[PDB]
Amino acid sequence: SAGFDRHITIFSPEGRLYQVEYAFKAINQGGLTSVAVRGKDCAVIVTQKKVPDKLLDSSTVTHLFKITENIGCVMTGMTADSRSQVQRARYEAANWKYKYGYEIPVDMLCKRIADISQVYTQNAEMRPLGCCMILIGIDEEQGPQVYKCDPAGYYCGFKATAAGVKQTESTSFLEKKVKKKFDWTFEQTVETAITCLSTVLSIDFKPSEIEVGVVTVENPKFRILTEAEIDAHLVALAER
């Protein structure tokens, strides 16, 4: 029955890869949560921030990063795995730009990095980088895309996705919002993300506890929403 949960390369009875699920549970171990919402021409990423003390530099503890000048990234899990995976993603995107002469589409970036994680989970020489990824960007003739990658190398596009400790409830809230079939304008997308986080956390957070990134068609650059604009957005949400 059990005892096959020791090696990444060992198939259990019923063909169940325990250690991969162990890594998926390790994703949650970071204790944080993150959600991504996409509109007609925008894609908003928001994540929670926990600070044990004022003693840390808040400018360096950002949980969302930028893969290329128009491709942004957010992720959760173990932070060391997080930074290693963003380093690998940036390396792969730069290699793609070098070899093929044009910017990496979000779907292809997710596909290649998921292939890397698959090769990690296929051979027993690697711990399969137990951190989940969400990538955002804009592509011509297809519009904005939001893609998610996991340590198993399973990648998929999302109209809206979530991660962290509150994965299931955040996904249920996302489904409840998307079943209403509304256009989700940029401010509306951002507010849906903030409301999802606040309700699934039941905290009604101060604006200093969230980092937000957004990519739009008119602003293809991955803009990290600064304190001024996140304050505007979420205190407007408060009054709205």
């Binding site: 930028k66 893969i67 290329t68 380093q87 940036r90 390396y91 730069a94 290699n95 730009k97």
Partner: protein, 195 residues
């Protein structure tokens, strides 16, 4: 060719001809020797074209890597260092002279030159190519300090015009770029515009 780049207070202006030939036959008369390496750092290429483009893409990848890791645009010094090491490591096989012009917030407008063999140096005017052996006296006689954007434009126009009319390896058009805090301005001189 004639790639002369000169910096001014606020940035650097860089110009080039548009002549590329395989022997006595002009292969392409629309050549651009100014390849944008980043948002506010450019380059000027002389010598074998394939080597210049290859190293241009390589350093584009490298300083894109650096700029995306630091979340901060690269300094001119780092870029010029990349061209220097790339040139030296292939200096036995590299026939290419590069001028690294550009502006950065750290210091401002900087001109770095890596001629044949790989001198990583900086100076006021960086003239390069087979057409750089003619206007050297012309620039030394017309060198003054602190040309404004208009005065820098006229310096470029006249200097590359003498190179154009005097040298047979410089032909076609004249391409200019102005890099500053406001951004990068790229302009082209053709027709009656060139003196």
């Amino acid at each position: 060719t004639t790639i002369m780049a000169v910096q001014f207070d606020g940035g650097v202006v860089l110009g080039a001809d548009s002549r590329t030939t395989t022997g006595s036959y002009i292969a392409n008369r629309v050549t651009d020797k100014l390849t944008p390496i980043h948002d506010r750092i450019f380059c000027c290429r002389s010598g074998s074209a394939a080597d210049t483009q290859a190293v241009a893409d390589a350093v584009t990848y490298q300083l894109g890597f650096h700029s995306i890791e630091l979340n901060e645009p690269p300094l001119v010094h780092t870029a010029a260092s990349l061209f220097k090491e790339m040139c030296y490591r292939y200096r036995e096989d590299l026939m290419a002279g590069i001028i690294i012009a550009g502006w950065d917030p750290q210091e401002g407008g900087q001109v770095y030159s890596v001629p044949m063999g790989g001198m990583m140096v900086r100076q006021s005017f960086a003239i390069g190519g087979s057409g750089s052996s003619y206007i050297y006296g012309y620039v030394d006689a017309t060198y003054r300090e602190g040309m404004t954007k208009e005065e820098c434009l006229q310096f470029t126009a006249n200097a590359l015009a003498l190179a154009m009319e005097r040298d047979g390896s410089s032909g076609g058009v004249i391409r200019l770029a102005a890099i500053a805090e406001s951004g990068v301005e790229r302009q082209v001189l053709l027709g009656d515009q060139i003196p």
